Structure formats: structure tokens, C-alpha cells
Design an enzyme around this catalytic site. Sequence first.
Site, PDB file in Angstrom:
ATOM      1  CG  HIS A  97     -19.780  23.034 -33.217  1.00  0.00           C
ATOM      2  ND1 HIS A  97     -21.123  23.069 -32.922  1.00  0.00           N
ATOM      3  CD2 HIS A  97     -19.133  23.311 -32.060  1.00  0.00           C
ATOM      4  CE1 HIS A  97     -21.283  23.359 -31.642  1.00  0.00           C
ATOM      5  NE2 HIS A  97     -20.091  23.510 -31.095  1.00  0.00           N
TER       6      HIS A  97
HETATM    7  S1  FES Z   1     -21.889  23.094 -37.095  1.00  0.00           S
HETATM    8 FE1  FES Z   1     -22.300  22.544 -34.992  1.00  0.00          FE
HETATM    9  S2  FES Z   1     -23.894  23.984 -34.415  1.00  0.00           S
HETATM   10 FE2  FES Z   1     -23.953  23.749 -36.615  1.00  0.00          FE
END
Ligand code: FES
Lengths: 379, 196, 442, 78, 59, 406, 100, 66, 241
Positions: free
Chosen positions: B161
Site C-alpha cells: 500500500h
Molecule cells: S504499506 Fe500497507 S502493507 Fe505496508
Amino acid sequence: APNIRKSHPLLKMINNSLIDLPAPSNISAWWNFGSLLAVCLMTQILTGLLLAMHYTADTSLAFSSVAHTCRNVQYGWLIRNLHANGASFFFICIFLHIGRGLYYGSYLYKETWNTGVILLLTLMATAFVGYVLPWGQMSFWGATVITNLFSAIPYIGHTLVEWAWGGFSVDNPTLTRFFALHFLLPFAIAGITIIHLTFLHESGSNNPLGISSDSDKIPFHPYYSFKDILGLTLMLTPFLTLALFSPNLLGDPENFTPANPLVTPPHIKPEWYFLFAYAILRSIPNKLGGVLALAASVLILFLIPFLHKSKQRTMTFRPLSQTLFWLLVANLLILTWIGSQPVEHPFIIIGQMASLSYFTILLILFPTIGTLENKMLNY
Amino acid sequence: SHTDIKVPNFSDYRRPPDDYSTKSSRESDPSRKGFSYLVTAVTTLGVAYAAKNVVTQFVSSMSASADVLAMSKIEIKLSDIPEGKNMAFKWRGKPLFVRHRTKKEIDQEAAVEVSQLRDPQHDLERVKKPEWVILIGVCTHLGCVPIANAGDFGGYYCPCHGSHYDASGRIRKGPAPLNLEVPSYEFTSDDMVIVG
Amino acid sequence: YAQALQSVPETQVSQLDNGVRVASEQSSQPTCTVGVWIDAGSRYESEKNNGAGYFLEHLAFKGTKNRPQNALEKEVESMGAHLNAYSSREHTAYYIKALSKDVPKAVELLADIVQNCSLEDSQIEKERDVIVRELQENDTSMREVVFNYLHATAFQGTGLAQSVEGPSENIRKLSRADLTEYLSTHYTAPRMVLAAAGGVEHQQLLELAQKHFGGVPFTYDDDAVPTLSKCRFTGSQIRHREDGLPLAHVAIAVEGPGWAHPDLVALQVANAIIGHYDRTYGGGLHSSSPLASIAVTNKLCQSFQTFSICYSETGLFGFYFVCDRMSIDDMMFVLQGQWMRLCTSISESEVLRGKNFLRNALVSHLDGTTPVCEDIGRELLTYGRRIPLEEWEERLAEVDARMVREVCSKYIYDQCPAVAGPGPIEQLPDYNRIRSGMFWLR
Amino acid sequence: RQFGHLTRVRHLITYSLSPFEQRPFPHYFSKGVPNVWRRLRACILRVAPPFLAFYLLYTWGTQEFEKSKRKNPAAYVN
Amino acid sequence: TLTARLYSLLFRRTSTFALTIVVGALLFERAFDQGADAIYEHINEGKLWKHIKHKYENK
Amino acid sequence: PPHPQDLEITKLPNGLVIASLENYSPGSTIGVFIKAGSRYENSSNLGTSHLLRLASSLTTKGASSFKITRGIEAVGGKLSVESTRENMAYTVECLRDDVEILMEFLLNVTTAPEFRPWEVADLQPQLKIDKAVAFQNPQTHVIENLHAAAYRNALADSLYCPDYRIGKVTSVELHDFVQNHFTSARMALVGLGVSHPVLKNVAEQLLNIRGGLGLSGAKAKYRGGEIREQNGDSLVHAAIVAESAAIGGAEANAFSVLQHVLGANPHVKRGNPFDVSAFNASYSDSGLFGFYTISQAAYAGQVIKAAYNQVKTIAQGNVSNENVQAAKNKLKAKYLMSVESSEGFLEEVGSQALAAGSYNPPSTVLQQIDAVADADVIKAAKKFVSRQKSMAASGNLGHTPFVDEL
Amino acid sequence: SRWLEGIRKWYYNAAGFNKYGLMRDDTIYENDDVKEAIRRLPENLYDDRMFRIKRALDLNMRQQILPKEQWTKYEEDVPYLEPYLKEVIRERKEREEWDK
Amino acid sequence: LVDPLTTVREQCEQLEKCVKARERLELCDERVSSRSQTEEDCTEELFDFLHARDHCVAHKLFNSLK
Amino acid sequence: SDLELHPPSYPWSHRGPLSSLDHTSIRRGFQVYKQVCSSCHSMDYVAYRHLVGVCYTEDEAKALAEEVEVQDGPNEDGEMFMRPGKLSDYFPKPYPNPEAARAANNGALPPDLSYIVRARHGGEDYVFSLLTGYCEPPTGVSVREGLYFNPYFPGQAIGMAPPIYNDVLEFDDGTPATMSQVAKDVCTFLRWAAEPEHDHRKRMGLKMLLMMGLLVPLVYYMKRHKWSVLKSRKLAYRPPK
Ligand code: FES
Ligand code: HEM
Ligand SMILES: CCCCCCCCO[C@@H]1O[C@H](CO)[C@@H](O)[C@H](O)[C@H]1O
């Protein structure tokens, strides 16, 4: 409708099956087995599903996976115990249920009765598989015979087998597919159990007097909901006393030895709730005949309804057939004992004797003693 | 007729000895109800007990698995990790980071605007030897393994993410909520290091 | 208004050294009504005595010794007066409506009956076969048999479960004597009440009563009035089924407090709330009375009525409905639900209406001479004195919602009810079901 | 099959009492236990027989087997 | 008068009733548990590890 | 201070008689008397009267079906309609201030009916039952027919809508019926427990129609009809009449007196298990006189003959001036008594205030009943025996005679 | 040698449905023919049979039975349905026969 | 140190039953080893002995063990 | 001949439905297993981990695990290599595979004593009788080379020589190490080995009984209570005349 207990396409179902459902006022304990049966199906599915979360369908791991489930998963031992023994309380209950039905002509309600026979069969089948799951000596050799049991069917036989289980001998393939059936069948049971009750509800429940009960009939709820929650707890204490005090009471110890494809143990005894049939199978010295006999032993249930000759439904006022009845129940009880015995003269004969008294008490004595009592009434 | 029907005698036959005319049924039974509901209350009670536990059991029947390990100690040759690079080790069920930081890295990591951090911590209070940084290779957002030598902060980056980490393992940009976990550890010599 | 109430003439009363209390309310009205209201009933009858008070009612008019049949009727007919009467379980009454220009003549006539009935052993034997018939009519008034049964089981085992008319065995065998026994035993001054209403002047009435009711008490007993045995209520049921009948009647009730108890007011307001319905009305939009409303929307009943029938020290607060073989349940359900709503979540808006509706009957209860007389008679006999609409006004003008709940819940909630139901009642659920219907899954 | 459409019944009166007004307990000893016996004794002679019988066949049969297991003193008197 | 006071307060209002079941369950538990354990442990003195825990922790 | 406050009457320019009478009773009851009825119906529209009688609670132009019923009830009111073949009385009752409130609704109900096509098409099935209950009393069945045989035209029309027309009354026929009868000149705003100025100050809104007599029913033609209803009820109902006595019509009081003169006679003139009485209906331009007899089946012929002979020889000089003396007294009672209950009393002050516009005091009303005696009666009875007779019957009748057999 | 008559009274008391207070015919299972027969039954006998059965249900549901005095006696048992039942059957067999 | 087992087995080998069996056995033993060609075995006899013996060994042995 | 001798019944301290296991006695059993059986018998389903809190101490069991070097995971060059046993390891197999063991035991295969007590009818009673029960074969019966008579074992000739005799070890708790004694302690171990739950499971059974005991009666009153309305009931046939 203001009700809401009658105006809700879903909610009405409950308030049309467990509340308001008209039930004969005079109903003995012998009507409790059923709601218990349903409860067993629950108990089983719940525990089993819970247990399947830790099982591992595979030769090299099955056996140990179960052990790990008991020794490591918190209460996994309790869970297995309940699952293992539930199978039994399940057959106990089903057996009693079939009995009751047989001795009240509950069988005249054909469809409810026929679906029933399907449940017994499925229950039996689902219970065979699964026991094969922990993959101990018993598991394996059970799998090899019961499957091989279809070999008897000519042509489509040896084929059906080397397909039934994995490929060409009980092995991993045949295990993984068994786990599958076993996971799948309980639901099919619940399924048919719905159909079952359906045909039942069409015609009211039966009743011990074997005479219309429209003259009475109480609202299922206030009454039977209670009567059942009571039957629940009574037939709940024994089963919990086994699972807690003597777990392997009803379970062969031989099955604690992992499977060895090279040695079937001496003294292979099928799990109790299968003995009677077993007894019949061996005592008719023919692969086929024996099988047919087996077939018939259970498959006979379908004919019960066409063997009703009494002008009366239940057989409460049929002192004659009434004892003929217990002769059978015991006749069965003997086949069980006989089934737990090695093949020697003291037995064997006793075997094929009982294993015959069975079939006649059913295909011939009953209907006969039947029309007979009728004539003893001027009918 | 109908004037001729009479309700039978339910006298001793049933009626509880507080119900035999000439005296109010009321005031009497409205005590009898108490008993009959007491049995009930209690049953719900006992059942409750029973229930509470069957659930409890059948709930921990998964929660964890009474098969928990421990391995808290690992030895690492600090020379395996030359300056500028980060090595990933197998440890306690989740990755483990051990990094040799350059003059530049350690410098930038102290130059970090700490009052402005999502999870406020100065590089020096998160490590013991500034040329050596140790972290748990698990992103705090949703658990993916952060990629070393990637991202906009010369530390790490999580491809799940987009969380950006600094050479200190602190979360800077992205969705991660707290900074990377710092294990318990200490240096037993010049090139020796032990985590746990 | 309230003034209209206050400006209403007080009710005069005055006891004789006899025992007879003489009360009366005056008006302009030429005509009037006067009568004696005895504290007699079937509740005072025995197992072999049951029926008397009624069999007696049927001879109280057929003449006295002083003036045989022909004469009494003739003397009454001829003066354009109406002498009618009745016999309940705890209250008997005999009354005439004349032109007040006859207070004296009527009074004497009244007296001559409560005192000297011919009881011609021949006239009896005839009334015997009459009642026995008249009783056979009473039977197909399902509307009635349904209540007797109610009492029959609600007060099972006590005097109150006995019906007023009496068994057909007693009527066939009461003796000239038994009627006399009944008469001489219960028709005594200390229990009877000379009441009247119209253009009558109390005094003239006194002196008249004082003159023809020349009763005289010697002993202490004579002067005292016996308290009856207490009647044990019993949450139970009686189902007299017959799918042959057009439809079924259902009545269910709880033990009520009794005349004396002040709550009967609050309680009265409650029944005022759900009220009563009948398929002739004109309002599927009826006032609150949802039962009615719901009765209308869901075509639940042919009719249903609420009631607080009460007695000296007990009573029956319940309801009754008539309905097609098919809607018995929804009706019970929908109605029994209203009982809960009533003592679980009743609103001010309702009582407000409730009250007024009552005050409207409260009033029309005294609509004419006869009715007024009927209250004075009852009033004294059961309440002690007279209760002025100005009092009733206060009593019930102070009932708030909260109070209704308080009370209804007090007499309704979680009590074991009494159910009665003749007819094609197969659809009415067992006792337990309608029993757990007494407590709301609050 | 629901309620209100089961049968044509006429002239049956029944009288029952709130469960709180009577005693669920009931009359054990008076009518209670007596009937219980009225039933053991009523079928003990219809049920037990076949079970009793098996019992024997059981005992007989096992014993026989167990006997058939031991040596015949004279299987080799020589 | 227990029963009457119990009904009048606890059992009457469907609300109260439950509420006491909960509070009652709590007490029943703590109480039943301690006891069963006691009974149990008693019937097994010196056999439990709790009882032996001491030869490496005294008794 | 004494409650005497003469009942004032004040005929408005319309013809809307207004009669009040404060009697200080707590509960007052107002009422709109109308010269409407089933007498003004034709071969068609029949029963519109009846249906109009039930549309009492249907929406108006000032208040909805809803508000009207819940409004009257919010006060503990009562709104009801009583109707005869030739007059409709819409009364309403309550108390104190609520009278004022209870009025709006009454007003609207009688002048602003907007008989909605649905509300009616949706109400007509009610006739079916309203009628079904009524007919539960054999008395009503007989009488319905009696009038059918006694007359041949208006007034001989049914009071309860005929069956074949139950669902055919149009929303129209209703307005047309109201408009043509519910008019100021044939209405009367009577009431009790009210001050007259107050009750008048309302007939001002009530002014919304004038047309004197909108349809004026056709005179009533008499006939010696005779209809028999074979139905087997274990007991027969019979009624025998001879046209006679119009309201206000001098010759009337005679029969009322003969009505009481008769009775102790017909009853005491028939022996066994039965019931028989002297029937007497006095209408606007005609009336009926005779006797109905509920009798056991087979004893049907006996009782009607006997009771008939009695009305016969009572004409041939079988009346002591004493009989007349007693009977003159019973009327004095039944009149006076049947005026105690405020509804049956508001019936007097109203019925008159409509028919005349006056109010004969209980003094002269007696002086009028007193007025006549021996003089008539004996003669009044004669008129019965000579005039044409129309009989009506319900029952087994297998034993009941026809008029042609006397 | 051994009267079927003697036998019938045996079986009749052996069966024991008389202890519940019902006649033989009260117990015949209700198949199509019985239903059609009971349906022709005069209202007297129907209502009786009803009560009779309901009483039994109530007894059976109580586990108790009828006092020795009230049990119906073999010779007093009334085959109130047998006749109707037979006609019904031959009425039917006739139809069946014809539809061939 | 002496195994309470052998001690208790001594006592037990003299209880009526055992002696009865022991004898019944001693005879079989010296009856088979007495002949050169026989199929008989003294397992049965031996078992009956043992069975009876250990049966009490068991009804007492565990008392003297810790 | 299918002629066999069934084991008598010993009054095990843990037999009773409510009686736990003599934990102290199991501690010893462990020892007799660890010092003598564990060289021919694997016990795969148990691990030092369990001993902790039942019969041993954490540090005690930790140390007790240290004594065994176990072959663990691949290097960085990938090659099995030894290392001190962790608390988590399971009890050590004496042989690499069965055929390995069979070779080292005159051909026979010593079973895994994990579920031994419940893999054989009679459990401890059997296992006990077996250990403390060898002897000379009665006459006519000849046990072949490599075997040893034991009447309790099916066939009388086992492949296992008497493994336990007086003093074979020294119960560090100062207990007379008689064969009988040490044989008992093993079995009691073997039972817990087959079912660690045992104690938990029984304490549970106890509480269970009490509830059934308290609940079935309570729901029995309730059932009755409700039903009374019917049991008590009274019919009556009152037709007209
Ligand atoms: S940025 Fe969401 S899994 Fe690490
Ligand atoms: C698979 C599980 C089954 C469940 C859960 C079950 C359950 C039920 C239920 C809930 C009833 C209600 C009344 C009673 O309990 O007697 C019922 C009735 C009945 N069942 Fe089943 N059943 C099962 C299998 C069977 C079997 C194997 C038979 C076949 C012999 C059978 C035959 C019947 C009959 C005859 C009735 C109706 C007659 C009566 O109620 O008197 N059932 N079943
Ligand atoms: C239907 C009756 C069910 C009885 C309740 C089951 C009680 C299970 O109770 C169990 O007791 C153990 C011993 O103390 C505890 O260790 C467990 O945590 C606890 O859940």
C-alpha cells in the site's frame, strides 16, 4: 396480518414448525428421538467442522494430524471425543427412532419413512468415511473392505472400485476424496432431513394410539419444545459421561496403530453400530450372496410398509405381533453380539440362525401374525 | 341445560395447599409464581453457565495453537553486512533486518524532523551503534515485508500500500501507523551481534 | 357544567329503627319510580337452596295474601304503573314506576310483596314448569351461557360459581317451604332499601315506608347483616365445544377488587380505553380502541366488549368477544395484546379520552327515574351511601395515564386468567399460550 | 394441516387449571408410583421373555466356545 | 419472604428477570468453580503437580 | 335555581324551526329532525334512505370520515341516526362545553355530505348486514311486509333497502335525495341542556338550503293487501290492520285509548302459551290499526280469530266507561313516563317542533286525551270491523287463516 | 375342540383397547374405506366415537387408564362402523370390477 | 531390597486356588516331559495357575509399592 | 491354538472416574522410560514441553532437553548439523526408520510407546503384567532363538527380553527401585503419555455430572409444570337430550 409470527415469509416458517405446529397430545418419549437426531446432526457438523480445521488429508500426515489436534489444539481432545462419540449417540438415537416408527406403523406415512431410510443409509455412509480419516489400522482395512464390497456388482464392479477410492488400492488419492465426501455428506443429510420433515408435516405426527388425534392436538411449542429440551438433557448426560469418563469405551483400540497396508490385524471388528449388518454379511459364504444379504439387511426397510396387514396402525393392541416385535429387537441384539465374535462353531450357526430369523420375522412372521390377529377380531 | 354444568373438584387432587377456598387465591399464589419462576430462573442460570464454557472452550479451539515456539537468540557476523547494505535473516516466524549504515545515512537519520514524525522517535534512541540498525521486517500497516533499498526515504518501502520508511525504520510517508519494530539486541564484540 | 353537577339535588337517606334505609332523589317529574333492593342473591343460596331467589322472583308478582293475583295485577294494571324486577348473584330488586301521585300506594304494594307473597302452592307448581322452560331458552343465548361458565370456573367451588337461575334439578324440586325459607331468611329490613326518584318528597316517602314496613327487631341478630363466605378465584378454563354453532364466544378475566375498592375507578377508565365493538358501528377509523380498529381492519370479531363486573369483596375484570370459527386466535392475540399495552405503555392522550367517555356514561347511567333509583338502591346497598356524579367526577377526573398502568398492571400483569369458550373453538390455543399472553416480553 | 380445520367435534367440555394453581409435582405414591408398577407389571411378561432368552443363548454359546477351547484329558491318554 | 420478595422484584418484570440471570450466572460461576475444584483437588491430595510443585518448590 | 326555563321556539325565515330547553342536565343532546324518509322513494333509488342512514360517518366538506369519528370520540361523544318511513332524526350527545365542539360534526353531517363515490361504493355492502341483524327479530319482517300490503305506493316502501338494490344505490341518488328533502322548511334544530340563544346562533351556519318541500311524497293509497311468508319458525307472527288515524288527526286519540281499552281484552281473551297486542301506527296522511300475535304454530288460527273477535265485540258495545277510565290513565303514564329518558323526551319536543311548530304542554296534551272517551272508542272499534283489512304473516302458517276467512 | 369364540374373548381382553374405553371399531386405522364409512356414520354415533377417542387420547397422554368398572366388555362392544364399512368396500369393489 | 512382588507372590502361591492349580500343573509338566512323542502342552494348566496367582498378586501388590 | 491369558486388574491410583494421576509416580515413570525404554522405543507425540507443569519444572525440563543433540535445518551451505535439544523438540527416536530398528532388535519392531496403553486392550494392566511377567515356557512349548517366553503376550514368544529388573536405575526421589515398583511407575507414565488430558478431562467429567444433576431436574420441573394443564385436565361428554 398483525401477528408477524404468521406474516413473515421466513419467521413464519419457525412459527409454523416449532410453535403452532399441531401435535398429538399423547406422545411418548419414543417421539423424542428425532429432535435428538437433528441435534446430533448439529453437534456432529459443528464439532466435525471444528475438527476439520486441524485435520490434514494425506497418508503421511492424517494420523498424526489428528493426534496433534488432540495433544495440541486446546480442547481438541474434547472436540474429537465429542465428535467420535456423537457418531454413536447418533446411531443410538437413529436406531431407537427407526424402532419407534416400526412399532406404531409410523411407516404408513411412506414418504417421511422412505426419506428416513435414505437418512439411515447416508448416515451410515457418512460414518464409514471419516472413520477412515484418522487413518489407523481400522480406518484402512475398513476402507479396503467396505469399498471392495462393491466388487460383487458384476462388470461395473472392480471398475467402480478402482475409481471409488483413488486408483488401484486404498491409498492417498482414496483418502483425500474420502475427507471430501465426509465433509460434504453431513450437509446432504441436513438437506434430506428438511425434505423428511416436510412430508411429515403434510400429515400430522403419528401418536401411540394409532388413531386420529385431531380430537386433541396441542401447540408444539409450550409443550413439546419443553419435552424435547428435556429429552435433550437426558440423552445428553450419558453421551457426555462417555466423552468425559470413558472415551474409548465404544471405540476399538486397534485403531490407535497407524495403518499398515501389509498387515490387517487379527481380530478386525467393525464399529459396533455396524455389527448386525456385518454379522449377516459373513454367514452366507459367498462374496455376492453375502453382499446381497448385507444389501437386504438394511435395504429391507423399504418393504416394511407393504408388509403391514393389521387393521390397526400402531401395535399397542396387538399382544401377538407385539412380542414378535421384541423377538426381533433381541434377534438384532444377538446378531450384534455374534458380530463381535470370531468365526467358530459355538457362534457361526447362531449367526446364520438369527441371520434368518431376522428376514423371516420381517418378510413372513409379521404380516402373517398380522392378518391373524385381524381374524381374531372378526376382520 | 347449562346451568347444570359444574367445574369439578381439583382439590387435593392437584391444587397447592394454599388454594382451598374461603380465602383469596391472590396474595397466596403471587408467591407461588415466585417459586415456579425460581426453578426457571435457575435453569436459565445453570444453562447459562454450561453455555458460557462450551463456547469459551470451542473458541480457544483455534485462537493460537498450544504450538508456540521461542528462539529469541541469533548470532550475526557484522562483517557479513558491509557499509551501505541491509541483510535479511530468517527469524522467529518473521523477517529480521540488520543494516550497516553509511556516514551519510546515519547523518540524515539524525537530521530527521522528529516533532513531525507519525511515530516520534530519534534515530539514536532506536539503535545502539549508529552504524548498525536492526528492525523487524514486517510493515505495521497490514503485515507485508518492506523492501530495503527502495522508497523515497532511503530506508524501505512496502509494495502492498506504499508506506515509506527511513534508514531508522520509522514510518514517514504512506498509511503504516507506527514505526518498524525494534527487537531486543546487543553487540558481544567488534564484529559480533546478537538479537533477542 | 361542573356547576350542572353541583346544582344537582342531594340524595336523601334515613334509616328506620327497623333496619330499612329509605333514600330518594327529588325532581320536578310528575312520574317516578320506587322500589326495594334486597341484598339477596344466588350467592346466598346453598347446594339444595340454589334457585330460590329466582323461583321466588317469579311469584313475587303473582299476588299476596292481602290481595290475590287478579287483584294485585288489576290494582296495578288499572293505575298505569309498571312493576318489574330482577335477581342477580348478590343483588335482588323489585320496582314500580307510577305517577308519584302514588308514592304511598306503590310503597304499600312494594311492602306487601317483600312481605306477604301468596306463594300459592298451585301457582308454584305452574311457575316450576315455566322457569324450567324459560331456562331452556336462556340456554341458547350463547352470549349468556358463556358468562355463567366464566363464573362457573373463575369462582369454581364457591357460591359465586353457582348461576342465578339454579340447576334444573332444584327448580323441579323446590318446596313451597324452601321459597318461604328463602324469603323469611333474606328479605329483612337491614338489607332491603326503599329508594325512589321523581317528584316525590322524601318525608312523605319516609312516613309511607315507616307506615307499611312496620317491621320490628327484638334480638341483636335481627339487627345485624351477615357477611358472606369469601370466594376463591382460580385461574382456569372451561371449554364447552360445539362446532355445530355459527360461531364462538370467548371471555377471559382476572379477579377484580370489589365495590369498596377505589381503584375500580382507575380500572373503570381502563376498560373505557379499549372499549367495545360491534359490526354495525361506523368507524374502521375508531377512536384509540385498536382492538376495535384492528378488529375492523383484520375482521377479527362480530363483537367484543370489556367489563369490570364486581361484587362485595371480589369481581371479574376481563373481556368477551364473539367471532367466526376462524379468527378466534388473532382476536385473542390482538386483544390480549391490548391488555398488555394498557398496563405497560398507556398514554395520557388515551386516558384523556377514556375519562370523558366514562363521564359520558357515568351520566347517562342516571337517565330517567328508574335508572336513578337503580343507583341509589345499589349505591347504599354496596357503597354505603350515595355517590354523587360530582364525586365520581372527582374520583375519575384525577386518573392519569401513569395511574392506569399502575393499576391495570396491578390486576392484570402475570396473573393466571380465567377463560370460558363455547362454540367452534378449535382454533383457540391451549391455556399456557393464552397464559404467557399475560406478561409482555417487555 | 393447521388449527381450526382438524375435525367436527361436538359437546365436549373440558376443565383445566393454570399451572400455578395446581401442582406439577403431582401425586406420587397416591396415583404416581402405583401406575408405574401397573405398567412394569403389564409388559414385563411381554418384553423380558425375548431378552431373557437371548441372555441364555449368549451364556450358552460363549461357555460352549470357552469349553471347546480346553484340552480333552483323553485326547492323548497315550 | 424470599419467594414473594424474589418474585415481586426479580421474576415479575421480564426485564429484571434476565438481568438477575446474568448477575446470577456470575455468582453461580465463581462459586461453583472454586468448589468443584476444591472437591476435586481434595479427592486427589498430593498427586497433583500443584501438590508436588514443591519438591523443587517445598512441601 | 329551580330549572324551569320554558322551551323557546323561534322559526327562522327559512322555516328551520329551532326548539331548545335548558334543563341544566350535565349532558346535553342536540338533534336535527328532518321530514325525510323511505316514503319519498320511487320504483328506483329505493333504499337510498337506508344507505343515507348509514352514510352518517362518511366525509363531509368540513370534516373527514376520520376526524368526524375520532373527533366525536375524543370528547366521549355519540353521533347516531334514528329513522322512520317518514322522518329522519340525526341526534348527537355529549356535555358541558363539548356540545359546541360536537356540533361542527353534526352540522357537516347533515348539510355538507360530499358522498364520495368510493366511500359509498365501499359502504353499500353494509346494508347487507345492517339488515341481516335487523331481521333477526321476526317482528321487523312482518311489519316490513304489513306496510307492503297495507299500501300501494309511498309509505308502502321498505324501511330497510331491498336486496336486489343493495349494491346499486348511486353516489348521485344520495345527493339528489338530500337536496330534495334536507331543506330548511322541513328541518328542525332541536336540543336539550342548551341555552336557546346559543342553539340559534348556530342555525345561522346551518343556513345552506331553502327549497321548502323539495319532493313531497305522493299521497298514501290504501289497499287490503295480504302477504304470507312460509318459513317454519315453530311460531307464527301475524298482524291485522285497517287504514286509520293520522297524526294530529282528531280521530287519533280514540284508537290510542282503544289501544289501551284493548289489550287486557285480546290477551285475556285468548287462552294457552302465546302473545297478542293492539297495534297502532299514526302517520302523516294515514295510519294503521289492529293487532299482532306471536302464537304457537297450530294454535295460530285460534289466537288470531279470538283476538279478532275481541276487537269485534269491543265495537258492539263491550266497553265499560270504566275501561275507558283506566285506559285514559295508562296513556297518561306511557306518555309521561316515556319522556323521562332524555332521548325519548327530545323526541317529543322535536317531533312536534317539526310537524306543527308548536308544543302542546303536558297539560292540554292530557286535556286532549281526557277530552274524549266512551264517545268514540266503541265507535273507533267499529271502524276496524268495517274497513278493509290487510294482514301480514311469518311462520309455519300451515294452520294460519287468510283475511278472506276473517 | 377350542372355540374361536373362546379365543376371540381372549384376544379381545388381551388386546386391551377396551381398557381405554373404546370399541373395536374405534381403533381401526383410518384408511380410505374407513374414512368414507365413518363419513356416512349418523351424527349420534359419530359424536360418541369422537368423545370416546378423545377420552382415550387423554388417558394415553396421562399414562393412566379406565377403572376396571368402565372397561367395555367383549359382548357389549358395538361394531358401530363395521356394516357401513362393508357396503363401502363392496360398493368400491363393484366400481373397480366395472372399470375393466 | 526385595521386590514386594516376589514376597506377595509367595504368599499368593499358597492361597487355596493356586495350590489347586499348581498341583494340576506340576502333574501336566512331569506328564509331558515324561514322554518322547506327545502333542500336549501345559500352557492351559499354566494359565489357570498364573491367572489365579496374579489375580491376588494384583488385589494386594499395589499396597506395598509407592 | 487361540488360547491366551488375560491380565488381572490392578487398583491404579488413577483408575477412578474422579481420581487424577499420581503425578509424582509419573515423574518416576518418565525416568524409567528415559533411562531404559527410550533406547528401543520412540515416543513421537510427546515433548519436553509437556513435562513442564505436570511432573517437571521448566528449567528442569529445559535442561532435561539439553541432554539431547538433535539434527537441525540446513546451513548457509545447507547441511544437516547437530545442536542442543530445545524444550520444543519431541522425545528422541532411537532409530532413523523402522527397518533400522528391526535390524538392531533380532528382527522385531519395538512399537512407539506414545499411544501404547490404548493401542492394547488392558492398557497398563496389560503392559504391567507383560513387564513383570516373564518365565520359563511350560512343557511341550519351545520358544525359538531370539525370543523369550511371556504368557501374557499373544503367542507367548516376544522379541523383547525382560527390560526391567531390580536396581536397573535409581529413582532420585529415594524410592525402592524393585522391578515391580519401577514397572508400575512406567505404566502410570505411559497412561499420561497416551492422554495428558486425563486429569483435566476428569475434573471436567465431575463438573459435568453436577450440572446434569442440577439442570435435568430443573428442566424436569419445568416440563412437568407446563404439562400439568393437560395431565390435570378433565373432559366430559354432555350431548343434548
Ligand atoms: S504499506 Fe500497507 S502493507 Fe505496508
Ligand atoms: C437422519 C436423521 C433423522 C432425523 C434428524 C429424523 C428426525 C425426524 C423427526 C424430527 C421426526 C419427528 C417425530 C419423531 O421424533 O418421531 C421424524 C419422524 C419420523 N421419521 Fe425421522 N429422522 C431421521 C431419520 C429417520 C429414519 C432412519 C427413519 C426411517 C426408519 C425415520 C422415520 C421417520 C418416521 C416414520 C417418522 C414419522 C412418524 C411419527 O412421527 O410418528 N426417520 N424424523
Ligand atoms: C451441560 C453441562 C456443561 C458443564 C460445563 C462444562 C464445564 C467445563 O469447564 C472447564 O473446567 C476446566 C477445569 O477446571 C477448566 O480448566 C476449563 O477452562 C473450563 O472451561
